[PDB]
Enzyme design. Structure first.
Site, PDB file in Angstrom:
ATOM      1  N   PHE A   1      36.715  44.693  17.966  1.00  0.00           N
ATOM      2  CA  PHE A   1      35.581  43.755  17.828  1.00  0.00           C
ATOM      3  C   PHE A   1      36.022  42.425  17.199  1.00  0.00           C
ATOM      4  CE2 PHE A   1      31.894  47.132  17.423  1.00  0.00           C
ATOM      5  CZ  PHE A   1      31.793  47.209  18.818  1.00  0.00           C
TER       6      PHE A   1
ATOM      7  N   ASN B   1      37.097  51.846  18.835  1.00  0.00           N
ATOM      8  CA  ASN B   1      38.008  51.079  17.971  1.00  0.00           C
ATOM      9  C   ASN B   1      37.415  50.587  16.660  1.00  0.00           C
ATOM     10  OD1 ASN B   1      39.982  51.398  20.022  1.00  0.00           O
ATOM     11  ND2 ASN B   1      39.045  49.693  21.145  1.00  0.00           N
ATOM     12  N   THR B   2      36.220  51.076  16.343  1.00  0.00           N
ATOM     13  CA  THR B   2      35.593  50.845  15.041  1.00  0.00           C
ATOM     14  C   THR B   2      35.281  52.206  14.422  1.00  0.00           C
ATOM     15  OG1 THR B   2      34.738  48.652  15.609  1.00  0.00           O
ATOM     16  CG2 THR B   2      33.569  49.834  13.854  1.00  0.00           C
TER      17      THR B   2
ATOM     18  N   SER C   1      32.191  51.838  21.136  1.00  0.00           N
ATOM     19  CA  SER C   1      33.567  51.374  20.994  1.00  0.00           C
ATOM     20  C   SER C   1      34.391  52.481  20.338  1.00  0.00           C
ATOM     21  CB  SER C   1      33.655  50.135  20.117  1.00  0.00           C
ATOM     22  OG  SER C   1      35.027  49.819  19.943  1.00  0.00           O
TER      23      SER C   1
ATOM     24  N   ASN D   1      31.486  53.118  28.314  1.00  0.00           N
ATOM     25  CA  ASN D   1      32.594  52.439  27.636  1.00  0.00           C
ATOM     26  C   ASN D   1      33.949  53.074  28.020  1.00  0.00           C
ATOM     27  OD1 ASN D   1      33.913  50.771  25.647  1.00  0.00           O
ATOM     28  ND2 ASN D   1      31.922  50.700  24.589  1.00  0.00           N
TER      29      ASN D   1
ATOM     30  N   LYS E   1      24.752  51.395  25.232  1.00  0.00           N
ATOM     31  CA  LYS E   1      26.012  51.655  25.929  1.00  0.00           C
ATOM     32  C   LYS E   1      26.703  52.847  25.306  1.00  0.00           C
ATOM     33  CE  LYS E   1      30.195  49.410  27.717  1.00  0.00           C
ATOM     34  NZ  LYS E   1      30.811  48.039  27.870  1.00  0.00           N
TER      35      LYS E   1
ATOM     36  N   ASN F   1      43.017  49.258  25.313  1.00  0.00           N
ATOM     37  CA  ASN F   1      42.792  48.228  24.280  1.00  0.00           C
ATOM     38  C   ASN F   1      42.307  48.806  22.954  1.00  0.00           C
ATOM     39  OD1 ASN F   1      39.807  47.283  23.507  1.00  0.00           O
ATOM     40  ND2 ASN F   1      39.776  48.230  25.555  1.00  0.00           N
TER      41      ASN F   1
HETATM   42  C1  FMN Z   1      40.294  44.533  26.849  1.00  0.00           C
HETATM   43  C2  FMN Z   1      38.927  45.181  26.847  1.00  0.00           C
HETATM   44  C3  FMN Z   1      37.988  44.775  25.907  1.00  0.00           C
HETATM   45  C4  FMN Z   1      36.716  45.353  25.896  1.00  0.00           C
HETATM   46  N1  FMN Z   1      35.791  44.972  24.980  1.00  0.00           N
HETATM   47  C5  FMN Z   1      34.530  45.499  24.986  1.00  0.00           C
HETATM   48  C6  FMN Z   1      33.474  45.077  24.053  1.00  0.00           C
HETATM   49  O1  FMN Z   1      33.716  44.170  23.217  1.00  0.00           O
HETATM   50  N2  FMN Z   1      32.270  45.669  24.121  1.00  0.00           N
HETATM   51  C7  FMN Z   1      31.982  46.644  25.025  1.00  0.00           C
HETATM   52  O2  FMN Z   1      30.856  47.152  25.055  1.00  0.00           O
HETATM   53  N3  FMN Z   1      32.891  47.076  25.921  1.00  0.00           N
HETATM   54  C8  FMN Z   1      34.130  46.552  25.952  1.00  0.00           C
HETATM   55  N4  FMN Z   1      35.076  46.975  26.873  1.00  0.00           N
HETATM   56  C9  FMN Z   1      34.711  48.027  27.812  1.00  0.00           C
HETATM   57  C10 FMN Z   1      34.273  47.498  29.171  1.00  0.00           C
HETATM   58  O3  FMN Z   1      33.047  46.792  29.014  1.00  0.00           O
HETATM   59  C11 FMN Z   1      34.022  48.645  30.144  1.00  0.00           C
HETATM   60  O4  FMN Z   1      32.982  49.489  29.608  1.00  0.00           O
HETATM   61  C12 FMN Z   1      35.270  49.526  30.365  1.00  0.00           C
HETATM   62  O5  FMN Z   1      36.476  48.756  30.314  1.00  0.00           O
HETATM   63  C13 FMN Z   1      35.189  50.267  31.712  1.00  0.00           C
HETATM   64  O6  FMN Z   1      35.164  49.365  32.827  1.00  0.00           O
HETATM   65  P1  FMN Z   1      36.491  48.940  33.649  1.00  0.00           P
HETATM   66  O7  FMN Z   1      37.194  50.243  33.971  1.00  0.00           O
HETATM   67  O8  FMN Z   1      35.952  48.216  34.853  1.00  0.00           O
HETATM   68  O9  FMN Z   1      37.289  48.004  32.759  1.00  0.00           O
HETATM   69  C14 FMN Z   1      36.361  46.391  26.892  1.00  0.00           C
HETATM   70  C15 FMN Z   1      37.306  46.786  27.829  1.00  0.00           C
HETATM   71  C16 FMN Z   1      38.566  46.211  27.844  1.00  0.00           C
HETATM   72  C17 FMN Z   1      39.540  46.674  28.894  1.00  0.00           C
HETATM   73  O1  ORO Z   2      36.675  45.431  20.711  1.00  0.00           O
HETATM   74  C1  ORO Z   2      37.099  46.494  21.185  1.00  0.00           C
HETATM   75  O2  ORO Z   2      38.130  47.060  20.769  1.00  0.00           O
HETATM   76  C2  ORO Z   2      36.366  47.286  22.207  1.00  0.00           C
HETATM   77  C3  ORO Z   2      34.996  47.451  22.098  1.00  0.00           C
HETATM   78  C4  ORO Z   2      34.395  48.296  23.038  1.00  0.00           C
HETATM   79  O3  ORO Z   2      33.175  48.498  23.004  1.00  0.00           O
HETATM   80  N1  ORO Z   2      35.159  48.932  23.941  1.00  0.00           N
HETATM   81  C5  ORO Z   2      36.493  48.757  23.997  1.00  0.00           C
HETATM   82  O4  ORO Z   2      37.180  49.344  24.868  1.00  0.00           O
HETATM   83  N2  ORO Z   2      37.113  47.940  23.131  1.00  0.00           N
END
Ligand code: FMN
Ligand code: ORO
Ligand code: 9BL
Length: 366
Positions: free
Chosen positions: A119, A187-188, A185, A254, A225, A115
């Site tokens: 944000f 992505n910022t 993140s 993350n 995080k 992804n």
């Molecule tokens: C589509 C998507 C959006 C995410 N958005 C955020 C976010 O806004 N803030 C954040 O701290 N982590 C975000 N993450 C990271 C997840 O919280 C997690 O740290 C990461 O995906 C690893 O866990 P997983 O393998 O179970 O998905 C996002 C992950 C995905 C896949």
């Molecule tokens: O908003 C996102 O792009 C995002 C934030 C984040 O903390 N981690 C991530 O995988 N995506």
């Protein structure tokens, strides 16, 4: 294993993913969750799964990671899924659109997602009002072992990162059991540089001062995080600052900007953070490192590629007090939560642990 687990994993989810683009599927999942269009969570949480950490009781140690419910729209539906705790966000101070679509990609052959949402956020004010509408319902849930975390981000165009996080602490801190300073993140632009020693100390000093200024009943734990892509130096520095400042905990990790050898998905070279199975062991090893560097004295929420009880227990044994999942939900659907909990309970018994608490950091004591 249950009929629902198999039906969702083998038929319903892959069929719907074949019909819906990733972000449309994400939006539908949030809608279904908010509407309670969910299978029966048949699994009853045993005493073995209870964890006391971060000034709270957690009925089970399996949470929904940030990024599923970015704007706090599906909190109650997430508890109905059987999550022991819910994390919403990331939330930015002002509303912002995030990156252009498409910005989420499935790698089915890797059981992974990439992804680059960037944000996308309704902003602090919208989320504040959403949480206020259920604040007393949440207080009861928290008392009954079901805490709420709020994950804070920063706006794309903000000239003062520390002030963005400070605003988040002031506005959403009073509604949260814990806050997450998301400095990881991918992505910022420039965000991950806030993980550096000097930038982190300055930022976290300000965040903690703002937290400490909240009234007692409204004073959340503060966690940081972190990325899975840190150098050994970066990790040493984070551990040092965490201990210096008395940061309450870490969320590890993350998504990764790495692309491990062996990814098969056609979309493997899309820009963004990689999650799911290919991240799993990179995240477990980061938990292991951070637990050692903090002498087991700093609670860790372990996250990255958890899709089974074994995955959960590996992170717990590496030093996590709690775990989260997200990508597994996207592939297997709501029944994955009960599956992880059932498998985790069984493995704890098989490995001679009295409960989750006894297993935390067990590998370090082998
Ligand atoms: C589509 C998507 C959006 C995410 N958005 C955020 C976010 O806004 N803030 C954040 O701290 N982590 C975000 N993450 C990271 C997840 O919280 C997690 O740290 C990461 O995906 C690893 O866990 P997983 O393998 O179970 O998905 C996002 C992950 C995905 C896949
Ligand atoms: O908003 C996102 O792009 C995002 C934030 C984040 O903390 N981690 C991530 O995988 N995506
Ligand atoms: C809780 O949602 C459901 O139970 C169902 C049946 C949702 C239908 C839509 C669906 C197949 C979603 C799967 C999915 C996805 O396929 C992708 Cl790519 C993402 C990013 C997400 C994020 O939550 C996701 O949920």
């Amino acid at each position: 294993a249950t009929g629902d687990e198999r039906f969702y994993a083998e038929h319903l989810m892959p069929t719907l993913q074949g019909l819906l683009d990733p972000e449309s599927a994400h939006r539908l999942a949030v809608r279904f969750t908010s509407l309670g269009l969910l299978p029966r969570a048949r699994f009853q949480d045993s005493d073995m799964l209870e964890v006391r950490v971060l000034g709270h009781k957690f009925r089970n140690p399996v949470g929904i990671a940030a990024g599923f419910d970015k704007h706090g729209e599906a909190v109650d539906g997430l508890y109905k899924m059987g999550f022991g705790f819910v994390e919403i966000g990331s939330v930015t101070p002002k509303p912002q659109e995030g990156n252009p679509r498409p910005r989420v990609f499935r790698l089915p052959e890797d059981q992974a997602v990439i992804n680059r949402y960037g944000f996308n956020s309704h902003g602090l004010s919208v989320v504040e009002h959403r949480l206020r509408a259920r604040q007393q319902k949440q207080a009861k849930l928290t008392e009954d072992g079901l805490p709420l975390g709020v994950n804070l981000g920063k706006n794309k165009t903000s000239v003062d990162a520390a002030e963005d996080y400070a605003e988040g602490v002031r506005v959403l801190g009073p509604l949260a059991d814990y806050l997450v300073v998301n400095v990881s993140s991918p992505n910022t632009a420039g965000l991950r540089s806030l993980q550096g020693k000097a930038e982190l100390r300055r930022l976290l000093t300000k965040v903690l001062q703002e937290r400490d200024g909240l009234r007692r009943v409204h004073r959340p734990a503060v966690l940081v995080k972190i990325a899975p892509d840190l150098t050994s130096q970066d990790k040493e520095d984070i551990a040092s600052v965490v201990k210096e400042l008395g940061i309450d905990g870490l969320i590890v990790t993350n998504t990764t900007v790495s692309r491990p050898a062996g990814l098969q998905g056609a979309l493997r070279s899309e820009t963004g953070g990689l999650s799911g199975k290919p991240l799993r062991d990179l995240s477990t090893q980061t938990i292991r490192e951070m637990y050692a560097l903090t002498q087991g004295r700093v609670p860790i929420i372990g996250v990255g590629g958890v899709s089974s009880g074994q995955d959960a227990l590996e992170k717990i044994r590496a030093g996590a007090s709690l775990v989260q999942l997200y990508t597994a939900l996207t592939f297997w659907g709501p029944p994955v939560v009960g599956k992880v909990k059932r498998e985790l309970e069984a493995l704890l018994k098989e490995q001679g642990f009295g409960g989750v608490t006894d297993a935390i950091g067990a590998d370090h004591r082998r």
